[PDB]
Amino acid sequence: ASGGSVIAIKYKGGVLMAADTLLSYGSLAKWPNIPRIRLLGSHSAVCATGSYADFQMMAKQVEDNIERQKMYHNVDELSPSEVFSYLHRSIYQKRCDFDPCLCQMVFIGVRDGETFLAGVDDVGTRWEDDCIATGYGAYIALPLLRQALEKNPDGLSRGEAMRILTDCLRVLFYRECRAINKFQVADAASDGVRISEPFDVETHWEYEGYCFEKTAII
Amino acid sequence: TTIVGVVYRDGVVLGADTRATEGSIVADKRCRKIHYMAPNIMCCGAGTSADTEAVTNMVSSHLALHRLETGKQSRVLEALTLLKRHLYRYQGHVSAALVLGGVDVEGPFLATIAPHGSTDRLPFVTMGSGSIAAMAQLEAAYKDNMTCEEAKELVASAIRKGIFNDPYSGTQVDVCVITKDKTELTIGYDKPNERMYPRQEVLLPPGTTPVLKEEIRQL
Amino acid sequence: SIMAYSGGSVMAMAGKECFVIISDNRLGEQLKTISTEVPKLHVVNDSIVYGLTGLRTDQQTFANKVQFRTEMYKLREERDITGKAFAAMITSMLYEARFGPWFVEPVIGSIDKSTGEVYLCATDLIGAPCEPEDYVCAGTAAESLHGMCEALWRPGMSPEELFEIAAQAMLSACDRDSLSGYGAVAMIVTKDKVTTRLIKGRKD
Amino acid sequence: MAETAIAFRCKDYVMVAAAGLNAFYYIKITDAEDKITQLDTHQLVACTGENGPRVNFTEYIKCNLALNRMRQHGRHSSCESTANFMRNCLASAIRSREGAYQVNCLFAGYDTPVSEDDDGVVGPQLFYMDYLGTLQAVPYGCHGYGACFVTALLDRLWRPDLSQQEGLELMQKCCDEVKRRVIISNSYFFVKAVTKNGVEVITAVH
Amino acid sequence: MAETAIAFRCKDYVMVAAAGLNAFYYIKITDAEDKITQLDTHQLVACTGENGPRVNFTEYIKCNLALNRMRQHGRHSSCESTANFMRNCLASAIRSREGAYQVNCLFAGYDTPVSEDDDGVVGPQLFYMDYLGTLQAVPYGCHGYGACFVTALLDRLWRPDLSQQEGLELMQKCCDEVKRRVIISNSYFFVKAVTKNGVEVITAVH
Amino acid sequence: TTILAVSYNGGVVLAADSRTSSGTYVVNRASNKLTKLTKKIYCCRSGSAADTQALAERVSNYLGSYQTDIGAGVNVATAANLFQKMCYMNRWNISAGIIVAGYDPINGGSVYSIPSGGSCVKLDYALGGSGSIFLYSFFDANYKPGMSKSECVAFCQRAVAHAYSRDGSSGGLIRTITLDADEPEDQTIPWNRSPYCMEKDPKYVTQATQNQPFSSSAKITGNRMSSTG
Amino acid sequence: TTILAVSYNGGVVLAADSRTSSGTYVVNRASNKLTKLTKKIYCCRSGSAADTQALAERVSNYLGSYQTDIGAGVNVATAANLFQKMCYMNRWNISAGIIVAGYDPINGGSVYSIPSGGSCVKLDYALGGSGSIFLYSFFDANYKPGMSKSECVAFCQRAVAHAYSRDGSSGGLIRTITLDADEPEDQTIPWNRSPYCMEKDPKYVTQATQNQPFSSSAKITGNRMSSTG
Amino acid sequence: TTTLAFRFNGGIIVAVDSRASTGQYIASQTVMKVLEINDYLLGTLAGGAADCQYWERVLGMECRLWELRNGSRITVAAASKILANITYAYRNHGLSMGTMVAGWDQFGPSLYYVDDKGSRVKQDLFSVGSGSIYAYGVLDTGYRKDLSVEDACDLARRSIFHATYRDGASGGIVTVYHVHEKGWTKISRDDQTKLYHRYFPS
Amino acid sequence: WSPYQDNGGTTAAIAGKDFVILAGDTRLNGDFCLHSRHDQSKIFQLTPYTYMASNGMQADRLQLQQMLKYRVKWYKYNNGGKVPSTKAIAQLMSTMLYHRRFFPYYTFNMVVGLDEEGHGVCYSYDAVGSTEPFLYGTRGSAASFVEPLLDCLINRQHMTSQAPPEMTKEETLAMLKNAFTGAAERDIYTGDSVSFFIITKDGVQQESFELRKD
């Protein structure tokens, strides 16, 4: 059972991550009611394109390692930067056993103002940036997200960074096969991460070029 | 390659990158991917540059010869059907991925011909490496009955996605407006990728490179 | 690779009312060298020079064809073929064998004798013409030559300047290529005169 | 590759040398198979491949050159000609149903003035030819395992100006180098030279 | 297969012969590599494979036999013994991670009475051994391309009773048949015989 | 791809998704898979768009020639038997799964499944394409032959939706077309107003309880939705 | 293979076909695919019979040891998380598609799909095995959560039937089992009395008009059934 | 690569080219191919540069450890044999290293070709790498055992040069060493294009 | 599933008499897209004086980067505080690439810095661990485009013209800017920005420089 496509984008004093609530066993859209965005401790979210199985094991192993280190020794919880470094090595270690975590994770989190957003690959390829996408998001949504960061070079507002996700999510929905029009949005701010109730997006299907008579082969 | 079409109220706007690659090299920075099919029909080409050029020419020719026989402007459906039947006969070995725009008597017509001979007559289309990135910008911003200005500025935007967010597409946006009356082919409508750092002229003075033998011949 | 077998590199370069086309001299089978006196340039007429690179068999076969076609032109048409035509004729000939191709990459220099405008064409093996203002290259040193030509080459250069950067290009690339070198034969075409130079390089 | 042909061209003769070794898998049948065919009075071709394509190609040439001498009232075609004919035939073959003639030729001859009016090359002509049809004029060439030992040994010693006598001494060293250094027992070499006078069979060297 | 070993056993000597040819792909390095190692005063093994496994197997045996002569206070083990030890080592190797020692041995010796009490075989012993560990006592054996030419030539001529002198004449014909008939230039042969007196290096034959 | 013809009393309804995917990316969002052969004889097209389009045009041409020379209408049989021959001749080269449906005055509403092999099976209703496999059970349950023209359309839409909601390959618009004695009625239900979708169905509102907070109790509550909680 | 758990208010219903095929031959006609882990926690088993039986026993053993030492009932979660770990460790070696359903007093009626990969997805209802693919649409249409124990059983049977009637791999008996506060009620619906089958459905009585006599008229009548006619 | 050593009365010449080409493109034109292990041992690298540079440097550790332990320099016999036993243990680990361990010890000069497959051969004359075939050509012409140190280096330098001239993978700089009773000395370090204008002045 | 993924990009180094310039592009490109335009992972500081540019797979460059730091950080403790020279780390790189030759790091490294004299030096590796000291060098997509240019403008091999005086820190930088600019324009997989590190005796001085965006 595979996850669709994640997108995430830094705004002023936070990160948005967004993901279809769908697992897909090959072509078949098996489950449309899956919460794919998980919270890692008090500061951070994670979410993965690819084998929900290998993500469910990695996100379990990490969320343990956090709430252990915190509860056992009288320490500050791990910063998102650290949690993500632990996730990155955990994944690299698994590709070095030829037993890979066969899933592209996006990862968001915010300690103070310190705002952190990163991807990681099956193989350990890790990259911070001001916008991430995995799966089709990378070929579709990233182009639009990068355009919305070029155009507001001081940084996006939370309303702007929500409208530009909603625009990408609409386009993922049109163009990615294994997607549905029911997304959640994680929002990392100072207070911590909040995952939205599932929402759909408005979709335009009644172009005059999409009518029957024009598209007819004969 | 990334090439794009949109239907606007008056006619069609095609778009193309210009970067013609050999493997992981830029052979030509400014190559023209929007070929003349007919006076009222342009035809952008992605895929094997040979096949795109040869198919395109063979048909532009066939059309021009047929445009004498009839004494009538070539219809876009005719051009489409010739690219189809030709590309289908070669089972997609002829790897030409065409966007065929034009405007006949019936009105604005914009199709894709995928290499196998598939045809999708649509209001906005993309083909080539950068297609997916372009089709994002196109799906977001496209609306019905755009003006020529909106429609160019969109197409340019959609190419610029493919140009930056894909390697094989690059350099500048060629844009072509086919309206009912005419065909405006604007080369470098947009130059996003100008010169970064001016050329440091290395000076090799005549008689530098050592020459064993020489033969001059006058005319 | 079948293209890299016989080795060779060719490069053309446009200046003001002149172009310099320049080959290497090597002929190989893979790594072993046969001859070091095999320039890859042919001269169609006064105003066209084309290098062929790739499988030497086909360089030689496809050359004899181009020679048969540009002679049959010169009799029927009663005039020297022009760059434009010649380059488009070559694409037609290469594409005629889309399936079962000639393993040859024709680089074509040309210059309209009236106007003085330069025309270059670097056709790939199935006749995909690439016709840039500046310069073109092909063969084994192609990656390395694009690197050289891009740095060294400026727009409106004079025959002597151009040759010295075309020669430095072809040489400084064939240093970094196994399958090219043993000098180079340049050929500096102007409206006025055609200067054929044999350049000394490495013996490697 | 088993059977080494050597050839080199000097002021006033081409010398050609070709393995005697006739092999069936790993079995020496004999060391006395002449692989240097004579196409003309003044032209011979050290062909080295498997016997089938070697014979069927050197016969096809030898016939279609004799056929030209008939139709051209005893006119002896230049070396450039037959070399370019041989290669045009070898090239035609890599794009037919048959496949390539799998034969590596060292075509050698001596263009003499054919009449009063001849202005063309007087003197000796050696051409190296791959099975594909890679024709190339050369001062000295080789085919077969031994080739690369001889090719370097000639680079060293071969000058363009040595006698008929210094050519026997050199061709002995070229032959003796294939004997010393190749496992495949190329133990007898048929050596034929082309001069102004015609083809002569050098028996001294082997 | 390149490098032919020959051996045959008569009334009162074993004769062994092994290619001198040391090859790197298709290149004769030399014709003077002794492949007949001496394991004892009275035992030698014509090993013919690639140099790596040939040396690392004939050394391993030669050491583990010397090690036995130490621990057994100068007692010279029978041929039957070392042969069976060599094969048990070769066989053990085809079912290890290493894989088979890729070496074709003609183990030869001369069992002398080791004390007063010895009742065992007096006289010469030849054993053919495959790389797999197929040990077999034989009158005459061979390994390499040349093998099957010699094997049949011995069937014809070899009698059990010929002299030391008729063994030189025969071993010359066996060596000369590999020279005439195999392409691979096995042009010099190291010939060693085992007698009652020990190993002697026959220089006459090659 | 999801396609289906069903026959009602007078005539037939074809229905189709409008998505052509190159596997996982949606190349076209609004493809007409219903392809006119004659006035009243439409074929649906599953599998390689190229091959069905080339066959639809090749047959639509012969039916045109036929229709002219016989000086009468074409029997749907004729369309299906032409389409069988061309799907059969090339059955190795192509990947084409056709449904010829239509109306002629002689037989009325005829439906022929021509799947891959070039079989040709006159039926009450045919399912083609990737997203067929979902419908088979859905038909067996909810299909009830002797429907009105109105219901058969409203049904087919409902069906094509149930399929394209589970199939990845299928999705977008639900083009139908009713072919009977009267003039062909095409209608194109856009996704935003589709009769069924998993997104808007109240079954799947309440999320799976996967994430689940760090608790002192095996009692499953809901997902963790705030870092503060 | 067709398997499905659904939860009603109090507890769950598992349901299964009873056929294990070696492809096209039916090795066993009456397999119990519902495999007791504890008193109230059954797993369904799709895929290699060997691998699911070996895992069902390996888990049924740990749950037995667990249930003893904690001196209390097992949470269904515990059964599913054990089954996930074992399906996940070997996910490459095995071919196992499990559904752990059950009742514990804490959470009530829990259902976990553990498909191939070793995902583990707590759901209202899970479908497994070849014959799943048919049901997905059938559920999306006819399933309506908040069913009584009685209906959920009568439903699951109807479902498993619609699946096994279309799937080849699936077929035979429809074993169910209800796991709630009360004592486990297994029942085994034999094929001859199944709720749905294509054979007995009046939709499919009238044969396809394939054979069709040699006639002087394009008018399709029926099949040719006598040589005399 | 081309790499040749040979034994004569005066001692052992080792000549090499100085190019490491990946088939078509040339990485480096300055690879030092004579590995200097001890001060009485020359390893030559040909084949997988990685495996040689590593193993011939290991050999170097084991040769030095022997000098410490046994209070006296290793033999070349034993030096080569160490390398041969390392390459034998790794024969089916896909090593690639045609090496030549040359040296002078108690028992005269000794040259040993050592293969990837654990091979170990006492050579009087030898050449490794793509252009060996070319070197051997020239080298078997001029080679006697009674050369002066001058003519031996002249011969080796030509031999490498004529491989550089023909082989595409062989080129760059023609380094020559000598191995004598006093250790080894680097004779020359001539560029192979200057060499062409020495050996063929016209 | 392939455990290797070429993450592209180009590194160059040029060693003068006082300094080393070390350049590595910031394009980290995955499979047919690009992940980041500001990836600094290419170059990594080991000591004040010694840097390790690294191409190919990022994930492996990043593992090796740590693995190398934790053998430098060990060397610091065992050899009482003292930092390892460039020449030491260089051989350590070769030694550590080889211990993993039976599952190689898919990473074409260059250890760059100053030797004990202050003369700048660079070493190059292949995945397996083949040390070659060079003076000017370039691994990656634009190896073939840059390395012939540098070959011409430094060595001046085929020029009659007298060799230029020496080449200062600022000229060698200006040469590399020009080279990379001509590699971004002609190679597809090179672009965005280039991080230059100018190691001298005084300390490193990094100045990022803009290329073509495509």
Residue numbers in the entry:
A (entry chain b): 2 to 219
B (entry chain I): 30 to 248
C (entry chain J): 2 to 205
D (entry chain K), E (entry chain Y): 1 to 206
F (entry chain H), G (entry chain V): 55 to 283
H (entry chain Z): 100 to 301
I (entry chain a): 126 to 339
In the authors' words:
Target deconvolution and cryo-EM studies reveal that compound 8 is a potent and selective inhibitor of the chymotrypsin-like activity of the parasite proteasome binding in a site sandwiched between the β4 and β5 subunits. The potency of 8 against the nonpathogenic Leishmania spp. Leishmania tarentolae (EC50 value of 40 nM) was comparable with that achieved against L. donovani promastigotes (EC50 value of 14 nM). In addition, inhibition of the chymotrypsin-like activities catalyzed by L. donovani and L. tarentolae proteasomes by a set of compound 8 analogs correlated extremely well. These data suggest that inhibitor pharmacology against L. tarentolae is broadly similar to that seen for L. donovani, providing confidence in the use of this nonpathogenic surrogate for subsequent structural studies. Apo (3.3 Å) and 8-liganded (2.8 Å) L. tarentolae 20S proteasome structures were obtained using single-particle cryo-EM.
High-resolution cryo-EM structures of apo and 8-bound L. tarentolae 20S proteasome have revealed a previously undiscovered binding site for inhibitors of the chymotrypsin-like activity. This site lies between the β4 and β5 subunits and exploits an induced cavity that is lined on one side by β4 residues that are divergent between human and kinetoplastid protozoan. The structural basis of the resistance mutations identified in our studies [G197S (β5), G197C (β5), and T30A (β4)] can be rationalized based on the distinct inhibitor site that we have uncovered. In contrast, T30A (β4) has no direct interactions with the ligand. It lies at a pivot point between the β4 and β5 subunits, allowing the β loop, which contains I29 (β4), F24 (β4), and Y25 (β4), to wedge open to create the pyrrolidine pocket. Comparison of the apo and liganded structures obtained by cryo-EM suggests that a T30A mutation would alter the ease of this motion, changing the access to this slim pocket, which is important for activity and selectivity. To investigate the selectivity of 8 against the human 20S proteasome and rationalize the role of the single-point mutations causing resistance, a homology model of the L. donovani 20S proteasome β4 and β5 subunits was generated using the L. tarentolae 20S proteasome cryo-EM structure as a template.
